[PDB]
Amino acid sequence: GSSGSSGLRKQVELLFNTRYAKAIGISEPVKVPYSKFLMHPEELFVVGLPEGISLRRPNCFGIAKLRKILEASNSIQFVIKRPELLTEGVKEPSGPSSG
DSSP states (O other): OTTSOOTHHHHHHHHHHHHHHHHHTOSSOOOOOHHHHHHOTTTEEEESOOTTOOSOOTTTSOHHHHHHHHHTTTTOEEEESOGGGTSOOOOOOOOSOOO
């Protein structure tokens, strides 16, 4: 960043994380399962975001953008539709029989 470093990233994180908390009824900032919101943008998304900006890692974006978001923090909001997505993982397939 011009004259300094893109310290927004850290800020953004707090914003997103913080926002998420409210999405989970938490007071402190929590991690944001981007993927969950990525693979499930219809279920998990963010509202209030500025123009030409969405939900993504606070790095791919540009300082200007980062700021915008930070500027639209109060506006920003992590709306949850299907939290069941958050809780997901990988498992092994069941076999026919053993022996």
